[PDB]
């Protein structure tokens, strides 16, 4: 019934991972697998350690929001929660850091030149003779307008534009392949 627990050596706690360490002396006499009291001693030691960890864990602050269920990503105000601290144990990583980036020639040119990066304003470009935005790329853009239009006043020239666009795409792919070796 009593909850008091104490040890001679101060206990080390890892609240960031719900773990604790107890460097206290281990009783080899009773820990032997052949002993029957072994199980009871292990149970008592585990209970004491868990009591100490819970006492230390509950001392952490707890958040209390004023919101409601709301969306699926919300949190209920009623559910009190303990704010755990940052992790302390430096567990080994599983993969390296992908700090490597693309050294494409464009970045070097931009660094050398004063050309600031594009602001990515939007897809809605403007055209004429249609009374509509007709965005550049994304849905029935001006790229296919030259093929769709039925007057090419200037041998089939409609296919030549598509061939030129495909050649530009191939050139972009070749540039990508060349930069992949950086």
């Amino acid at each position: 019934l009593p909850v008091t627990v104490e040890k001679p050596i101060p206990v080390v706690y890892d609240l960031g991972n719900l773990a604790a360490f107890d460097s206290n002396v281990l009783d080899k006499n009773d820990l032997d697998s052949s002993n029957a009291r072994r199980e009871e001693k292990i149970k008592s030691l585990t209970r004491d350690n868990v009591q100490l960890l819970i006492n230390q864990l509950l001392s952490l602050p707890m958040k209390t929001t004023t919101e409601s269920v709301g969306g699926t990503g919300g949190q209920s105000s009623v559910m009190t929660l303990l704010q755990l601290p940052d992790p302390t144990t430096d567990l080994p990583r599983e993969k390296p850091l992908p700090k490597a980036k693309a050294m494409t020639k464009w970045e070097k040119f931009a660094a050398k030149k004063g050309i600031k990066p594009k602001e990515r304003a939007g897809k809605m470009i403007y055209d004429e003779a249609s009374g509509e935005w007709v965005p550049k790329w994304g849905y029935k853009g001006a790229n296919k307008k030259l093929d769709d239009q039925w007057l090419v006043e200037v041998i089939d020239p409609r296919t030549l534009n598509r061939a030129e666009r495909k050649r530009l795409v191939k050139k972009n792919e070749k540039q990508q392949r060349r930069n992949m070796k950086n």
Binding site: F109, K112, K113, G114, Y126
Partner: protein
């Protein structure tokens, strides 16, 4: 020259491979980042933009 010549410096630095970006006044003193800044001390196109 020989070292004083800017051609030798360009060859040594390897910028000749990308000489297309040669800025007017490319020298050891006051490189492009400074030449362009100073050129501003040397806006009235009256263009008609479509404010849509």
């Amino acid at each position: 020259g020989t070292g004083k010549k800017e051609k030798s410096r360009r060859i040594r630095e390897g910028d000749t491979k990308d000489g297309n970006l040669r800025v007017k006044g490319e020298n050891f003193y006051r490189d492009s980042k400074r030449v362009k800044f100073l050129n501003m001390y040397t806006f009235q196109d009256s263009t008609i933009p479509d404010a849509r």
